[PDB]
């Protein structure tokens, strides 16, 4: 009768989940940025989905992790109430395109898309605010996504690393690029993942962590990039990193 | 070092707003009718002096 | 004794290029403006901001602009452009104002301390006044709490005030919300429908792309010039920059916190910013006794 | 420091203005019947003043 289930782990984010804070080009120096980050070495939730806890809240904001080789992750939904009353987010990815959509494409508490061709899904929309296209976010590989609104813009950055021959995720530095920052001004309140199944056998996997009110200290390159970074609150340590904006520390007594 | 962070502390706060709505000058120039800027303007300059 | 600058020889203002020009025309002459309680919100961008068609209508009642110069609004370069668009009686107008308190600042629309954007209210009397009288344009009196900046309510929240809902019959203390405005054409100024659009101008650290009609100049190298790049005004000279964005950002900063490259909104190569010449003068001199040359 | 039609089309004070303003009714003795229509005002020009 549970048609819909989901299994839920916990693992270790290990130090990922940075971005860049604003489209600011900065070489060779540290910057000090106050932000909704990911705490580093924090719990994720792994979550495996095969064909009953749909609500996942959104709190400030949220980090997707997609690990499969398979591609077989597409899309996501946004909403406050999750019903026809009020309007939600809606994102489709296919071979051709990316299609955001904010519209109240009423679905159950099973979401899904038909597989071939899915034009059996929807016929029209009733409303739909705001809409755009682009080329497809999704091309082993990770793909890191962060997703947040902030003052009435939502934003989504990316990142998708061509992971070596190994297992987990590694102890490296993948800073997200920010894809898109769309003006909508919805309330947001929680997000469901729509996975891809074909007309049936089929699994997911992912990982969710929640973003929280951090400061956080960035390593820019001479190239522009990130390449470490250091969680000022996470140890002693690193609050004497963050005093001193110096990866490296001297012996001696900070306050 | 001394001198260096002397001089850097320096230009780190000609960027602070001192409660003014914004940090650069030209901008507000372009922004604001005289009257209701000049608060601001005396904001940033007491700020920088 | 003095300070030597090398004052700009010229000014160049790059804006990207964008044909289509914004439905301005439409946020105005929509023969529909809805009404207070449920007031529209259509965003402006990635268009040509015209101002002079907000011009070309009538004699606008009150056209007052809070965190921008009304005649800088060509100038100026705009990241979003948020069109709150109602209809209020004539003297509730004047309470969006600051200082100024009233029922349609608090339960229908407030504004923030820090609004940068402009109030353009005009009458329509001669156009949406009929003897029958409109009763579509309804505003709320009645709410829980008091409303933040840019909050809109709508939901029928359940106003249980006494004990005993009055259950759709009339009774004490039991009063409609909504109150339908009296559009009689005989009442003077202050009962008249005001049509009135709150043009808020969003603007922030992101590419703008609505900026207005102002031709761009044809960029030019190593001269002291008047940079106006996406709403970044400065001086300095501009060089073909060594250094490498990534596709996503567009300007740059060093250690100081200060505009050291800007990509060019029309062609996408980065161009360094360096201070054109600035120094200190000193005068050599003898003892005036002794001679004058210096 | 006020604005509004009549400030900027019709008379215009400065900002720093040390002055006083006296302003009383008059309507029972510059108003007639027929009604005084050389009191006029501009609202209409192409700058402001
Ligand atoms: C991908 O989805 C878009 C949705 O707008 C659709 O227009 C397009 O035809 C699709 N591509 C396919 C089915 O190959
Ligand atoms: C679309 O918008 C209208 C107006 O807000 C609303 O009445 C309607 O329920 C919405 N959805 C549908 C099903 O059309
Ligand atoms: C950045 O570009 C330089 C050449 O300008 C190159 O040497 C460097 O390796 C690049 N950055 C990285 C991290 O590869
Ligand atoms: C107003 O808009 C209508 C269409 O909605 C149009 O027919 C009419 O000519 C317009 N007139 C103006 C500029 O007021
Ligand atoms: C318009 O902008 C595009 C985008 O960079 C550019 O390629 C093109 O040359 C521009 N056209 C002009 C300036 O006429």
Redesign the interface.
Same mark, same amino acid.
């Given at each position: 009768v549970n048609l819909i289930t989901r299994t839920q782990s916990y693992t270790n984010s290990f130090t990922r989940g940075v971005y860049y804070p604003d489209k600011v080009f900065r070489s060779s120096v540290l910057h000090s940025t106050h932000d909704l980050f990911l705490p580093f070495f924090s719990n994720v939730t792994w979550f495996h989905a095969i064909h009953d806890n749909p609500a996942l809240p959104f709190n400030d904001g949220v980090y997707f992790a997609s690990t499969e080789k398979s591609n077989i992750i597409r899309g996501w939904i946004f909403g406050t109430t999750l019903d026809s009353k009020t309007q939600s987010l809606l994102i489709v990815n296919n071979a051709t395109n990316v299609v955001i959509k904010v519209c109240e494409f009423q679905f159950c508490n099973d979401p899904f898309l038909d597989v071939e061709s899915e034009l059996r899904v929807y016929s029209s929309a009733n409303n739909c605010t705001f809409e755009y296209v682009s080329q497809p976010f999704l091309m082993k590989n990770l793909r890191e996504f962060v997703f947040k609104n902030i003052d009435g813009y939502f934003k989504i950055y990316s990142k998708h690393t061509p992971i070596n021959l190994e297992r987990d995720l590694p102890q490296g530095f993948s800073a997200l690029e920010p894809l898109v920052d769309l003006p909508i001004g919805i309330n947001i309140t929680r997000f469901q993942t729509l996975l891809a199944l074909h007309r049936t056998a089929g699994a997911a996997a992912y990982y969710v962590g929640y973003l929280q009110p951090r400061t956080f200290l960035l390593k820019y390159n001479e190239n522009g990039t990130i390449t470490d970074a250091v969680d000022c609150a996470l140890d002693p340590l690193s609050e004497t990193k963050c005093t001193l904006k110096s990866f490296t520390v001297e012996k001696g007594i900070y306050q | 070092n001394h001198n260096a962070q002397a001089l =850097?502390t320096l230009?780190?706060q $000609?960027?602070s707003k001192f409660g003014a709505?914004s940090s650069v000058l =030209?901008?507000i120039l372009?922004? $604001?009718? &005289? &009257?209701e800027a000049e608060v601001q303007i005396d904001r940033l300059i007491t700020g920088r002096l | 004794t003095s300070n030597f600058r090398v004052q700009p020889t010229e000014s160049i203002v790059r804006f990207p290029n964008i044909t289509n020009l914004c439905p301005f025309h439409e946020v105005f002459n929509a023969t529909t403006f809805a009404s207070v309680y449920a007031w529209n919100r259509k965003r402006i961008s990635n268009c040509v901001a015209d101002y002079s068609v907000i011009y070309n209508f009538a004699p606008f009642f009150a056209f007052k602009c809070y965190?921008?110069?009304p005649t800088?609004l060509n /100038?100026?370069c705009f990241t979003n452009v948020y069109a709150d668009s109602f209809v209020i009686r004539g003297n509730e107008v004047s309470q969006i104002a600051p200082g100024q308190t009233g029922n349609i600042a608090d339960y229908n629309y407030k504004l923030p301390d /820090?609004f940068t954007g402009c109030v353009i209210a005009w009458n329509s009397n001669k156009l949406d006044s009929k003897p029958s009288g409109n009763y579509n344009y309804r505003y709320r009196l009645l709410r829980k709490s008091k409303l933040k900046p840019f909050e809109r309510d709508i939901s029928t929240e359940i106003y249980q005030a006494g004990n005993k809902p009055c259950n759709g019959v009339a009774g004490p203390n039991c009063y409609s919300p909504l109150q339908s405005y009296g559009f009689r054409p005989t009442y003077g100024v202050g009962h008249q429908p005001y049509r009135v659009v709150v043009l808020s101008f969003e603007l922030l650290h992101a590419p703008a792309t609505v900026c207005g009609p102002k031709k761009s100049t044809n960029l030019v190298k190593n001269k002291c010039v008047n940079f106006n790049f996406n709403?970044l @005004?400065?001086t300095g000279v501009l060089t073909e920059s060594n250094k490498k964005f990534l596709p996503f950002q567009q300007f740059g900063r060093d250690?100081? /916190? @200060?505009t050291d490259a800007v990509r060019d909104p029309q062609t996408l190569e980065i161009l360094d910013i360096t201070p054109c010449s600035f120094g200190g003068v000193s005068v050599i001199t003898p003892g005036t006794n002794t001679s004058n040359q210096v």
């Open positions: - | =850097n230009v780190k $000609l960027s709505i =030209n901008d372009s922004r $604001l009718d &005289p &009257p | 965190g921008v110069s800088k /100038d100026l /820090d709403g @005004t400065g250690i100081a /916190d @200060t």
